[PDB]
Amino acid sequence: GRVIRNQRKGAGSIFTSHTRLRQGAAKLRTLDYAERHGYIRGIVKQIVHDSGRGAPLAKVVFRDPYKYRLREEIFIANEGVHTGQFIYAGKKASLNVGNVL
Amino acid sequence: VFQVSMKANKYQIKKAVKELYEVDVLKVNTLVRPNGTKKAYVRLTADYDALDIANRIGYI
Amino acid sequence: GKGTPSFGKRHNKSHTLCNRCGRRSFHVQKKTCSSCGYPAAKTRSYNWGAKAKRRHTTGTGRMRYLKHVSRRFKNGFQTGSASKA
Amino acid sequence: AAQKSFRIKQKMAKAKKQNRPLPQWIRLRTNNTIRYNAKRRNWRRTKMNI
Amino acid sequence: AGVKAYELRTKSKEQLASQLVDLKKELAELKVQKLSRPSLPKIKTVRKSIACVLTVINEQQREAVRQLYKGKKYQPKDLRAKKTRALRRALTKFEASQVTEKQRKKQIAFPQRKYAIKA
RNA sequence: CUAUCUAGCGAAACCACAGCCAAGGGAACGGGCUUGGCAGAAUCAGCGGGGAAAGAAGACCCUGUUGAGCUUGACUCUAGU
RNA sequence: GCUUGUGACGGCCCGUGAAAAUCCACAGGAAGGAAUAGUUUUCAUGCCAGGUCGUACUGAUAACCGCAGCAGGUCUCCAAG
RNA sequence: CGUGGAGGUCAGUGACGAAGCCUAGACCGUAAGGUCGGGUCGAACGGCCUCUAGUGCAGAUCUUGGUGGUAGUAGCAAAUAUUCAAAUGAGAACUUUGAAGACUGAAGUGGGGAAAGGUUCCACGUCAACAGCAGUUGGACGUGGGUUAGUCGAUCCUAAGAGAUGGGGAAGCUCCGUUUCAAAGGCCUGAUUUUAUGCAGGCCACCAUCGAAAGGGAAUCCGGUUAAGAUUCCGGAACCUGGAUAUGGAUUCUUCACGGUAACGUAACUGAAUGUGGAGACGUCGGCGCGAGCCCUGGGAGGAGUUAUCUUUUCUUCUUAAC
RNA sequence: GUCGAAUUUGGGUAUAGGGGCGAAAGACUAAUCGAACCAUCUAGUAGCUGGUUCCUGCCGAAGUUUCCCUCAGGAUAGCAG
RNA sequence: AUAUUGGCGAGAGACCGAUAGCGAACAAGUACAGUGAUGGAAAGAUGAAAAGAACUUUGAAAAGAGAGUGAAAAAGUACGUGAAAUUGUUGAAAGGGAAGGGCAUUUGAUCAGAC
RNA sequence: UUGACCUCAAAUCAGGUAGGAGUACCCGCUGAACUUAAGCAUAUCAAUAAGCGGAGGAAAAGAAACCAACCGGGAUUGC
RNA sequence: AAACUUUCAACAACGGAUCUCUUGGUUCUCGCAUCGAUGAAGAACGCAGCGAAAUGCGAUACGUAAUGUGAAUUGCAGAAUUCCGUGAAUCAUCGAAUCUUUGAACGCACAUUGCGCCCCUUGGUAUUCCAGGGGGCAUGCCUGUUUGAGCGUCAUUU
Ligand SMILES: [Zn+2]
């Protein structure tokens, strides 16, 4: 016979993912030091559509705790999160939607 | 109108004409001819006339 | 329509000139010569391509340096100059 | 094409130099056998494939 | 005709340099007057004469640096021997004649004795 | 517009040798053989009865200790697991 | 009116419709500065240079590909009454 | 019996003509074949005894080459269509010129390009071959001429991708992998003006490179000019980048501008590291507003056409670039 | 037939032969596809088809036995020189 | 001491002789075909010497007819010789839907021997 | 504080060397199938063709952790 | 009876067999050991008074230098002093050189005749900008050198 269609998918030649317009790697913030003992406040700049998934993504901006820098995060938006919100990320952060606990 | 080396550029052509002929070049135009050779259009300043220089070389 | 009408749609060269051999065998997208194996360091040649290697072997070209080595051997690989014998 | 690389136009100049009949005096040489140019090429008969 | 190389050897590097740029000028009007007349086989002699001048010039500076590097190791690579890549890498005769004392003693004490057999 | 006739230009398929029938016998359906009918140069435009016309070492059928694509609790193995 | 550019809107999407070089701006206050004299070349004027390769022509019932000067094929711009 | 070659011998034949070829001329043999005569030709070749083999053809849809009948035959009929005269020439249905009649009818039989071709472009000479008739003509033949850029492209960036390196596999040609278990790199300002850049320092953490002549992108327009080239030449008028650089201008003793309530304005009007923001930077369809070119049209100033009759008439010029 | 989109198409690029790609016809993968093309192994094997070259003289058959995955073939006896 | 179709330089042959011998005696791995890897021919001979035909004449020319060179143009760069298929011209003969063949002889043409 | 050792770096530091070509003959490594067996699978082609690495004028082997059982021979290579 | 068809002969055609040649091939023997980073083989483009190719060569380009021989080269033209000669030749030989652009191919690249950096020097009123000439700038690895890193580590301090 011949190799079959589910066999031909692992070569990853034409069966790859379409990733030109996908926004980024929507990950959480890093667990460096400022969440394991306190928190850090962040701002939501814009909530945008993501090609490929049906859930909007948020652009959450934090201040760098070690340099004069404005490191920005790519989170999956919670229903209720709005542009201009404040986001708290830490261990002692409150129990409010939008916070990372 | 001069036939110049294929390896030359317009700076060398301008300098070479000055050395050989004691004349000033205003501009240089280059084209590689369809027989794989370089032709140069060397325009003198108004201080010089190419009519009296072409026969000085010996072609006219 | 796979014959004459389709032959009017071939206008993009799959091969260009090859730097190392020049035989219009540099496959463009693969960036590899079909004939001489360029840009591999070695030269493509095979014991089944006996006709092919006979075509591109030592001696089929100008032999710009190896021609004189044979008589240089005969003269003991000497040095200097002849002294007007 | 109009826009072309220097390789192509250089190799066309080679093929334009070589496009003319045999020199006449060569057939007057001693022990000459070449009767004409057997490598003459025209643009309408065979293509250069360059 | 042309130039005689054995006459070029006597002149110094400054006289040859003037002659080379002198011959360069002369070949330039030969080219200018060739395009009018049908044939000019004199350009051949000037071309060869320039080559002869250039060649004789070259040997004068090449020997100047052989004497500059005379009597020392590390000659310039273009002035060394072009015997053969394999032969140039080959071990010298001094380095191929090195012998151990254990064999050196045996060579001194016991060489092949030249013997004949008649009686 | 062709076919038709003219000036110019000018192929191919195919061709053992060839080209009138009846019957006979014959590889059981002859252009040739036998007995008969007959039989007159050189030919032109058509025609589709015949030349079992041409185009292919039958693709059907069968045989061959000749295959291949495919299938499976065939035989013998094997990647992977 | 035709063609084309542009503006402000509307419809549509489980589709919401690239990247970088490059260019500018802002926040910040390092440093450098004034009096018989200093500072700005994001104001104006004034000076010099701008290399290399391409550039002709056809682009098709005759220049490309179809054994050819082949009723085939081959992406596109302008478009009068 | 015959053929290619080898040992021996006929002190064999031959430029006074070897071999070959042709010959409804002769002779021998049952035959394979052998011999002779005549013509043509020009340099080698046989009889006999033996030796040796790439040694004898009618066929293999045999191989290569060559040639017929078919046969002056099939044919040379798609794409509306030619005609008259003059010129040239040996020769004109086909070339040139004029006239007439037509067609493509602007998603053309028009004017430019991309891919491809490569000189086909243009001039002169020219028709043996090719243009399935012709040929004086030609994209043919012979000989030459012709492509001019800071601004148009490439050159730079990156996309999907390709791909070194540090490494890890693989006997191995090589495979993986592009920031990965790397000590991975370079810019500003000082200090000495024995002076090269050692030495004062701080800053930087991304990370080879290749990959689009339709993506992104610094800047040139008009007129004229050739047989053949032009946003490239010439004349004029511009702009951009880079680099040196002086004057005018601007500003200060309230040291680094003022005015307006404001949105904001101007000729400028110190601002290193560092950080933030914008442009680059973006779908498609629907209808609506505006601009540009064209189209239509009036008066007027010119030119051409019709005019038996009519037509203040029909056609045509009245343009304005980048900056 | 369809003709505003599951639309048409150029250029770039990715996918390579028991492999690709397939809105699935065993379709397409350079006029080649139910396993492309190129060279080599390779003068691949054939119990089967076709052909197999000078003369004369003398002699002159067989289609039958037995065994064989044997029945279009061989071995064997016989017939022949 | 052994091996050797590659390289270099030699000596040979009961080898082949231009469809043979290497694919290639020659501007042969060339012309040419394919995108490509690859595939791949044809093609030697005037004469001792070009002495390669001066000159006249017909034709637009190519060429023809003379003249000439040469031992020979029955050697004219379509060139040593120059077969067959196939073709033209002249001569001979036969032919009512094939032709060709055999035995025998008439007729016509030609011919050897013998004297 | 200073001077060593070990280990690991850097330099367009001084001097070098490997590559690639050719590859008939040699030393390895990988490795078929056509075919024969009147089928065919072990077997055979064949420890071969193809593929890869590595040399020389020869290579390789080579002076026994050998052969023998004789009254012992005595590196290897080749006939 | 012509024509036409068929057969043969002569002459003339078409065609390239045969015959006779051979600077070629093939096979066997003999002798020799010699490519390349000091840049091979190969490729591209160029070079002659008149060459397209083959053959030769590389911007010093059918070649320069050196040695030998000793009068040519030749299709045409030209040059003659170089002809009792330190000298013709498309001569042989070849020990000195040049050897464009590439190529294992090496500053980075390459479907581009694209893009940098360092050293010396020259010009534009210039270490910085532009241009020219010359020399450089690959990787693995060995030996040596020099500047270093590591609480890996010894000794010494204060
Ligand atoms: Zn190549």
UniProtKB/Swiss-Prot annotation, chain A:
Q: Which domain of life is it from?
A: Eukaryota
Q: Which subcellular locations apply to this protein?
A: Cytoplasm
- Cross-link Glycyl lysine isopeptide (Lys-Gly) (interchain with G-Cter in ubiquitin) placement: 45, 92
**Phosphoserine modified-residue sites:** 51, 94
Miscellaneous? There are 2 genes for uL2 in yeast.
Assembly information from the UniProt record: Component of the large ribosomal subunit (LSU). Mature yeast ribosomes consist of a small (40S) and a large (60S) subunit. The 40S small subunit contains 1 molecule of ribosomal RNA (18S rRNA) and 33 different proteins (encoded by 57 genes). The large 60S subunit contains 3 rRNA molecules (25S, 5.8S and 5S rRNA) and 46 different proteins (encoded by 81 genes).
Provide the family line.
Belongs to the universal ribosomal protein uL2 family.
Described function: Component of the ribosome, a large ribonucleoprotein complex responsible for the synthesis of proteins in the cell. The small ribosomal subunit (SSU) binds messenger RNAs (mRNAs) and translates the encoded message by selecting cognate aminoacyl-transfer RNA (tRNA) molecules. The large subunit (LSU) contains the ribosomal catalytic site termed the peptidyl transferase center (PTC), which catalyzes the formation of peptide bonds, thereby polymerizing the amino acids delivered by tRNAs into a polypeptide chain.
From the Swiss-Prot or TrEMBL record, give the protein name.
Answer: Large ribosomal subunit protein uL2A
Which species is this record about? Saccharomyces cerevisiae (strain ATCC 204508 / S288c)
Which section of the whole protein is represented? 2 to 102 of 254
Curated annotation (Swiss-Prot), chain B:
Where does the record say this protein resides?
Answer: Cytoplasm
Q: Which residues form a coiled coil?
A: none
Subunit structure, interactors included = Component of the large ribosomal subunit (LSU). Mature yeast ribosomes consist of a small (40S) and a large (60S) subunit. The 40S small subunit contains 1 molecule of ribosomal RNA (18S rRNA) and 33 different proteins (encoded by 57 genes). The large 60S subunit contains 3 rRNA molecules (25S, 5.8S and 5S rRNA) and 46 different proteins (encoded by 81 genes). uL23 is associated with the polypeptide exit tunnel.
Its family remark reads: Belongs to the universal ribosomal protein uL23 family.
What functional role does this protein have? Component of the ribosome, a large ribonucleoprotein complex responsible for the synthesis of proteins in the cell. The small ribosomal subunit (SSU) binds messenger RNAs (mRNAs) and translates the encoded message by selecting cognate aminoacyl-transfer RNA (tRNA) molecules. The large subunit (LSU) contains the ribosomal catalytic site termed the peptidyl transferase center (PTC), which catalyzes the formation of peptide bonds, thereby polymerizing the amino acids delivered by tRNAs into a polypeptide chain.
Q: What is this protein called?
A: Large ribosomal subunit protein uL23
Give the organism, scientific name: Saccharomyces cerevisiae (strain ATCC 204508 / S288c)
Upper taxonomic classification of the species? Eukaryota, Fungi, Dikarya, Ascomycota, Saccharomycotina
User: What's the encoding gene here?
Assistant: RPL25
State the covered range within the intact protein: 83 to 142 of 142
Curated annotation (Swiss-Prot), chain C:
Keywords associated with the record:
Cytoplasm, Metal-binding, Ribonucleoprotein, Ribosomal protein, RNA-binding, rRNA-binding, Zinc, Zinc-finger
Against Gene3D superfamilies, the record matches this protein to:
2.20.25.30
Q: Where are the zinc fingers (C4-type)?
A: 18-36
According to the record, cofactor stoichiometry and binding are noted as:
Binds 1 zinc ion per subunit.
Report which superkingdom the organism of origin falls in: Eukaryota
Q: Which GO terms describe its biological process?
A: cleavage in ITS2 between 5.8S rRNA and LSU-rRNA of tricistronic rRNA transcript (SSU-rRNA, 5.8S rRNA, LSU-rRNA); cytoplasmic translation
One GO cellular component term, please give it. preribosome, large subunit precursor
Q: Which GO-annotated molecular functions does the record name?
A: RNA binding; rRNA binding; structural constituent of ribosome; zinc ion binding
Locate the residues binding Zn(2+): 18, 21, 33, 36
Mind telling me which InterPro entries this protein's record contains?
Ribosomal_eL37, Ribosomal_eL37/eL43, Ribosomal_eL37_CS, Ribosomal_zn-bd
One Pfam family, short name: Ribosomal_L37e
Its annotated compartments are:
Cytoplasm
Q: Which cofactors does this gene product need?
A: Zn(2+)
What binding partners and quaternary form does the record give? Component of the large ribosomal subunit (LSU). Mature yeast ribosomes consist of a small (40S) and a large (60S) subunit. The 40S small subunit contains 1 molecule of ribosomal RNA (18S rRNA) and 33 different proteins (encoded by 57 genes). The large 60S subunit contains 3 rRNA molecules (25S, 5.8S and 5S rRNA) and 46 different proteins (encoded by 81 genes).
**Similarity annotation:** Belongs to the eukaryotic ribosomal protein eL37 family.
- Which additional comment does the entry carry? Present with 21800 molecules/cell in log phase SD medium.
The family database entries (NCBIfam families) matched by this protein are listed as: PRK04179.1
Provide the protein name. Answer: Large ribosomal subunit protein eL37A
**Gene source species:** Saccharomyces cerevisiae (strain ATCC 204508 / S288c) (Baker's yeast)
From Swiss-Prot, chain E:
* Cytoplasm is among the record's keywords: yes
Q: Which residues carry this modification: Phosphoserine?
A: 12, 49
InterPro entries in alphabetical order: Ribosomal_uL29 (IPR001854), Ribosomal_uL29_CS (IPR018254), Ribosomal_uL29_euk (IPR045059), Ribosomal_uL29_sf (IPR036049)
Q: Which GO terms describe its biological process?
A: cytoplasmic translation; maturation of LSU-rRNA from tricistronic rRNA transcript (SSU-rRNA, 5.8S rRNA, LSU-rRNA)
For this UniProt record, the keywords arranged alphabetically read as follows: Cytoplasm, Phosphoprotein, Ribonucleoprotein, Ribosomal protein
Q: List the disulfide bonds in this chain.
A: none
Q: Which Pfam families match?
A: Ribosomal_L29
- The question of whether Repeat is a record keyword is answered with no
Cellular compartment(s): Cytoplasm
Give GO cellular component annotations, separated by semicolons.
Answer: cytosol; cytosolic large ribosomal subunit; preribosome, large subunit precursor
CDD domains annotated for this entry?
A: Ribosomal_L29_HIP
GO MF assignments:
mRNA binding; structural constituent of ribosome
For this UniProt entry, what is the primary localization, expressed as one broad class? cytoplasm
Q: Which PANTHER family match?
A: 60S RIBOSOMAL PROTEIN L35, LARGE RIBOSOMAL SUBUNIT PROTEIN UL29-RELATED
> What HAMAP family does the record point to?
Ribosomal_uL29
* Subunit structure comment from the entry: Component of the large ribosomal subunit (LSU). Mature yeast ribosomes consist of a small (40S) and a large (60S) subunit. The 40S small subunit contains 1 molecule of ribosomal RNA (18S rRNA) and 33 different proteins (encoded by 57 genes). The large 60S subunit contains 3 rRNA molecules (25S, 5.8S and 5S rRNA) and 46 different proteins (encoded by 81 genes). uL29 is associated with the polypeptide exit tunnel.
Miscellaneous information on this protein: There are 2 genes for uL29 in yeast.
Family statement: Belongs to the universal ribosomal protein uL29 family.
Q: What is the official name of this protein in its record?
A: Large ribosomal subunit protein uL29A
Source organism: Saccharomyces cerevisiae (strain ATCC 204508 / S288c) (Baker's yeast)
